Coordinates of all heavy atoms in Angstrom, one line a residue:
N1 N 75.2 39.5 76.3 CA 73.8 38.9 76.1 C 73.8 37.5 76.4 O 74.8 36.9 76.8 CB 73.4 39.0 74.6 CG 73.1 40.4 74.1 OD1 74.0 41.1 73.5 ND2 71.9 40.9 74.3
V2 N 72.6 36.9 76.3 CA 72.5 35.4 76.5 C 71.8 34.9 75.3 O 70.7 35.4 74.9 CB 71.8 35.0 77.7 CG1 71.7 33.5 77.8 CG2 72.5 35.5 79.0
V3 N 72.5 34.0 74.6 CA 71.9 33.5 73.3 C 71.5 32.1 73.3 O 72.4 31.2 73.6 CB 72.9 33.8 72.2 CG1 72.3 33.3 70.9 CG2 73.1 35.3 72.2
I4 N 70.3 31.8 73.0 CA 69.8 30.4 72.9 C 69.3 30.2 71.4 O 68.4 30.9 71.0 CB 68.8 30.0 73.9 CG1 69.4 30.2 75.3 CG2 68.4 28.6 73.7 CD1 68.5 30.0 76.4
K5 N 69.9 29.2 70.7 CA 69.4 29.0 69.4 C 69.3 27.5 69.1 O 70.1 26.7 69.6 CB 70.4 29.6 68.4 CG 70.4 31.1 68.4 CD 71.6 31.6 67.5 CE 71.3 31.5 66.0 NZ 70.3 32.6 65.6
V6 N 68.3 27.1 68.3 CA 68.3 25.7 67.9 C 68.4 25.7 66.4 O 67.5 26.3 65.7 CB 67.0 25.0 68.3 CG1 67.0 23.6 67.9 CG2 66.9 25.1 69.8
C7 N 69.4 25.1 65.8 CA 69.7 25.2 64.3 C 70.5 24.0 63.8 O 71.0 23.2 64.6 CB 70.5 26.4 64.0 SG 69.9 28.0 64.6
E8 N 70.5 23.9 62.5 CA 71.4 22.9 62.0 C 72.7 23.6 61.8 O 73.0 24.3 60.8 CB 70.9 22.3 60.7 CG 69.6 21.5 60.8 CD 69.0 20.9 59.6 OE1 69.4 21.3 58.5 OE2 68.3 19.9 59.7
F9 N 73.5 23.5 62.9 CA 74.8 24.3 63.0 C 75.9 23.5 62.4 O 76.0 22.3 62.7 CB 75.2 24.5 64.4 CG 74.4 25.5 65.1 CD1 73.5 25.2 66.0 CD2 74.7 26.8 65.0 CE1 72.8 26.1 66.7 CE2 74.0 27.8 65.7 CZ 73.1 27.4 66.5
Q10 N 76.8 24.2 61.8 CA 78.1 23.5 61.4 C 79.1 24.0 62.4 O 79.6 25.1 62.4 CB 78.6 23.9 60.0 CG 80.0 23.3 59.7 CD 79.8 21.8 59.6 OE1 79.2 21.4 58.7 NE2 80.3 21.1 60.7
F11 N 79.3 23.1 63.4 CA 80.2 23.4 64.5 C 81.6 23.2 64.2 O 81.9 22.3 63.3 CB 79.8 22.6 65.8 CG 78.6 23.1 66.4 CD1 77.5 22.3 66.6 CD2 78.5 24.4 66.9 CE1 76.4 22.7 67.2 CE2 77.3 24.8 67.5 CZ 76.3 24.0 67.7
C12 N 82.5 24.0 64.8 CA 83.9 23.9 64.8 C 84.4 22.7 65.7 O 83.8 22.3 66.7 CB 84.6 25.1 65.4 SG 86.4 25.1 65.4
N13 N 85.4 22.0 65.2 CA 85.9 20.8 65.9 C 86.5 21.2 67.3 O 86.6 20.3 68.2 CB 87.0 20.1 65.1 CG 87.3 18.8 65.7 OD1 86.5 17.9 65.6 ND2 88.5 18.6 66.1
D14 N 86.9 22.4 67.4 CA 87.6 22.9 68.7 C 87.0 24.3 68.9 O 87.8 25.2 68.7 CB 89.1 22.9 68.5 CG 89.9 23.1 69.8 OD1 89.4 23.2 70.9 OD2 91.2 23.2 69.6
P15 N 85.8 24.4 69.3 CA 85.1 25.7 69.5 C 85.6 26.4 70.7 O 85.9 25.8 71.7 CB 83.7 25.3 69.7 CG 83.7 23.9 70.3 CD 85.0 23.3 69.7
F16 N 85.6 27.7 70.6 CA 85.9 28.6 71.8 C 85.4 30.0 71.6 O 85.1 30.5 70.5 CB 87.4 28.6 72.0 CG 88.2 29.1 70.9 CD1 88.5 30.4 70.8 CD2 88.7 28.3 70.0 CE1 89.2 30.9 69.8 CE2 89.5 28.7 69.0 CZ 89.7 30.1 68.9
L17 N 85.4 30.7 72.8 CA 85.2 32.1 72.9 C 86.5 32.8 73.3 O 87.4 32.0 73.7 CB 84.1 32.4 73.9 CG 82.7 31.7 73.7 CD1 81.9 31.9 74.9 CD2 82.1 32.1 72.4
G18 N 86.6 34.1 73.2 CA 87.8 34.6 73.8 C 87.9 36.1 74.0 O 87.3 36.9 73.2
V19 N 88.7 36.5 74.9 CA 88.9 37.9 75.4 C 90.3 38.3 75.3 O 91.2 37.6 75.7 CB 88.5 37.9 76.9 CG1 88.7 39.3 77.4 CG2 87.0 37.6 77.0
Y20 N 90.5 39.5 74.7 CA 91.8 40.0 74.5 C 92.1 41.1 75.5 O 91.3 42.0 75.7 CB 92.0 40.5 73.1 CG 93.4 41.1 72.8 CD1 94.4 40.3 72.4 CD2 93.6 42.4 72.9 CE1 95.6 40.7 72.1 CE2 94.8 42.9 72.6 CZ 95.8 42.1 72.2 OH 97.1 42.6 71.9
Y21 N 93.3 41.0 76.1 CA 93.7 42.0 77.0 C 94.5 43.1 76.3 O 95.6 42.8 75.7 CB 94.5 41.4 78.2 CG 95.0 42.4 79.1 CD1 94.2 43.3 79.8 CD2 96.4 42.4 79.4 CE1 94.7 44.2 80.6 CE2 96.9 43.3 80.3 CZ 96.0 44.2 80.9 OH 96.5 45.1 81.8
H22 N 94.1 44.3 76.4 CA 94.7 45.4 75.7 C 96.0 46.0 76.4 O 96.1 46.0 77.6 CB 93.7 46.5 75.5 CG 92.8 46.1 74.4 ND1 93.2 46.1 73.1 CD2 91.5 45.7 74.4 CE1 92.2 45.7 72.3 NE2 91.2 45.4 73.1
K23 N 96.9 46.5 75.6 CA 98.1 47.1 76.0 C 98.1 48.6 76.4 O 98.8 49.0 77.3 CB 99.2 47.0 74.9 CG 100.6 47.5 75.3 CD 101.5 47.2 74.2 CE 102.9 47.6 74.5 NZ 103.9 47.3 73.4
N24 N 97.2 49.4 75.8 CA 97.2 50.8 76.0 C 96.2 51.4 77.1 O 96.0 52.6 77.2 CB 96.8 51.4 74.7 CG 98.0 51.2 73.7 OD1 99.1 51.4 74.0 ND2 97.6 50.9 72.5
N25 N 95.5 50.5 77.8 CA 94.6 50.7 78.9 C 94.6 49.4 79.7 O 95.5 48.5 79.5 CB 93.2 51.1 78.3 CG 92.6 50.3 77.2 OD1 92.2 49.1 77.4 ND2 92.6 50.8 75.9
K26 N 93.6 49.2 80.6 CA 93.5 48.0 81.4 C 92.3 47.2 81.1 O 91.8 46.3 81.8 CB 93.5 48.3 82.9 CG 94.7 49.1 83.4 CD 96.0 48.2 83.3 CE 97.2 48.9 83.8 NZ 98.5 48.1 83.7
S27 N 91.6 47.5 79.9 CA 90.4 46.8 79.6 C 90.6 45.5 78.9 O 91.6 45.3 78.2 CB 89.5 47.6 78.8 OG 89.0 48.7 79.6
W28 N 89.7 44.6 79.1 CA 89.6 43.3 78.5 C 88.3 43.3 77.6 O 87.3 43.8 78.1 CB 89.4 42.3 79.6 CG 90.5 42.1 80.6 CD1 90.9 43.0 81.5 CD2 91.4 41.0 80.7 NE1 92.0 42.5 82.2 CE2 92.3 41.3 81.7 CE3 91.5 39.8 80.0 CZ2 93.3 40.4 82.1 CZ3 92.5 38.9 80.4 CH2 93.4 39.2 81.4
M29 N 88.4 42.8 76.4 CA 87.3 42.8 75.5 C 87.0 41.5 74.8 O 88.0 40.8 74.4 CB 87.4 44.0 74.5 CG 87.4 45.3 75.2 SD 87.4 46.6 74.0 CE 87.4 47.9 75.2
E30 N 85.7 41.2 74.6 CA 85.5 40.0 73.8 C 85.6 40.3 72.4 O 84.9 41.2 71.8 CB 84.1 39.4 74.2 CG 83.9 38.1 73.4 CD 82.7 37.4 73.8 OE1 82.4 37.3 75.0 OE2 82.0 36.9 73.0
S31 N 86.4 39.4 71.7 CA 86.6 39.6 70.3 C 86.5 38.3 69.5 O 86.2 38.3 68.3 CB 87.9 40.2 70.0 OG 88.9 39.3 70.5
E32 N 86.6 37.2 70.2 CA 86.7 35.8 69.6 C 85.4 35.1 69.8 O 85.0 34.7 71.0 CB 87.8 35.0 70.2 CG 89.3 35.5 69.8 CD 89.6 35.2 68.4 OE1 89.0 34.4 67.9 OE2 90.6 35.8 67.9
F33 N 84.7 34.8 68.8 CA 83.5 34.0 68.8 C 83.6 33.0 67.7 O 83.3 33.2 66.6 CB 82.2 34.8 68.6 CG 80.9 34.0 68.8 CD1 80.3 34.2 70.0 CD2 80.4 33.2 67.9 CE1 79.2 33.4 70.3 CE2 79.3 32.5 68.1 CZ 78.7 32.6 69.3
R34 N 84.1 31.8 68.1 CA 84.3 30.8 67.1 C 83.7 29.5 67.5 O 84.4 28.6 68.0 CB 85.8 30.7 66.8 CG 86.5 31.9 66.3 CD 87.9 31.7 66.0 NE 88.6 32.9 65.6 CZ 88.6 33.4 64.3 NH1 87.9 32.8 63.3 NH2 89.2 34.4 64.0
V35 N 82.4 29.4 67.3 CA 81.7 28.3 67.8 C 81.3 27.4 66.6 O 81.4 26.2 66.6 CB 80.5 28.7 68.6 CG1 79.7 27.5 69.0 CG2 81.0 29.5 69.8
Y36 N 80.7 28.1 65.6 CA 80.2 27.5 64.4 C 80.6 28.3 63.2 O 80.8 29.5 63.3 CB 78.7 27.3 64.5 CG 77.9 28.6 64.7 CD1 77.4 29.2 63.6 CD2 77.6 29.0 65.9 CE1 76.7 30.3 63.7 CE2 76.9 30.2 66.1 CZ 76.4 30.8 65.0 OH 75.7 32.0 65.1
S37 N 80.7 27.7 62.1 CA 81.0 28.4 60.8 C 79.7 28.8 60.1 O 79.7 29.8 59.4 CB 81.8 27.5 59.9 OG 81.1 26.4 59.5
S38 N 78.6 28.0 60.3 CA 77.4 28.3 59.7 C 76.2 27.8 60.4 O 76.3 26.9 61.3 CB 77.3 27.8 58.3 OG 77.3 26.4 58.3
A39 N 75.0 28.3 60.1 CA 73.8 27.8 60.7 C 72.6 28.0 59.8 O 72.5 29.1 59.1 CB 73.5 28.4 62.0
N40 N 71.7 27.1 59.7 CA 70.5 27.3 59.0 C 69.3 26.6 59.7 O 69.5 25.9 60.7 CB 70.7 26.9 57.6 CG 69.9 27.6 56.5 OD1 68.8 28.0 56.8 ND2 70.5 27.8 55.4
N41 N 68.1 26.7 59.1 CA 66.8 26.0 59.6 C 66.6 26.2 61.1 O 66.3 25.3 61.9 CB 66.8 24.5 59.2 CG 67.1 24.3 57.8 OD1 68.3 24.0 57.4 ND2 66.1 24.3 56.9
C42 N 66.8 27.5 61.6 CA 66.7 27.9 63.0 C 65.3 28.1 63.5 O 64.4 28.6 62.8 CB 67.5 29.2 63.2 SG 69.3 29.1 62.9
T43 N 65.1 27.6 64.7 CA 63.9 27.7 65.5 C 64.2 28.1 66.9 O 65.4 28.1 67.3 CB 63.2 26.4 65.4 OG1 61.9 26.6 66.0 CG2 63.9 25.3 66.2
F44 N 63.2 28.4 67.7 CA 63.3 28.7 69.1 C 64.4 29.8 69.3 O 65.3 29.6 70.2 CB 63.6 27.5 69.9 CG 63.5 27.9 71.4 CD1 62.3 28.3 71.9 CD2 64.6 27.8 72.2 CE1 62.2 28.6 73.2 CE2 64.5 28.2 73.5 CZ 63.3 28.6 74.0
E45 N 64.5 30.8 68.6 CA 65.5 31.8 68.8 C 65.2 32.7 69.9 O 64.2 33.4 69.8 CB 65.9 32.5 67.5 CG 67.0 33.5 67.6 CD 67.4 34.0 66.3 OE1 66.7 33.9 65.4 OE2 68.6 34.5 66.3
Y46 N 66.1 32.8 70.8 CA 66.0 33.8 72.0 C 67.2 34.5 72.3 O 68.3 33.9 72.4 CB 65.6 33.0 73.2 CG 65.7 33.8 74.4 CD1 64.7 34.7 74.7 CD2 66.8 33.8 75.2 CE1 64.8 35.5 75.8 CE2 66.9 34.6 76.3 CZ 66.0 35.5 76.6 OH 66.1 36.3 77.7

C-alpha cells in the first residue's frame, strides 16, 4: 500500500522498515515496520 498520515507521532530515534528472506522457499516478505511507537490527533489520512 501507500500510506500518508499527518499525526502527533512518537517517532523512533532510528526508524526502519524491513524484509526477511525465508529459508524454506525463495520468498522475501515484509515483517518489520518500526517507524513510530504511537500516534494520535490524526488528520489527512490516506
Side-chain angles (χ1 to χ4, degrees):
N1 291 95
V2 178
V3 179
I4 300 173
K5 294 172 76 72
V6 179
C7 308
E8 294 184 342
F9 287 101
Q10 176 65 71
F11 286 117
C12 182
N13 193 65
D14 191 3
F16 61 88
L17 304 174
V19 179
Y20 181 84
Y21 177 57
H22 287 287
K23 185 173 182 180
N24 293 317
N25 49 74
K26 300 296 184 181
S27 294
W28 294 75
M29 296 184 181
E30 181 174 319
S31 63
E32 293 285 342
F33 189 97
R34 296 181 182 280
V35 177
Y36 61 90
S37 65
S38 69
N40 210 326
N41 309 95
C42 295
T43 190
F44 189 66
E45 182 173 15
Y46 169 81

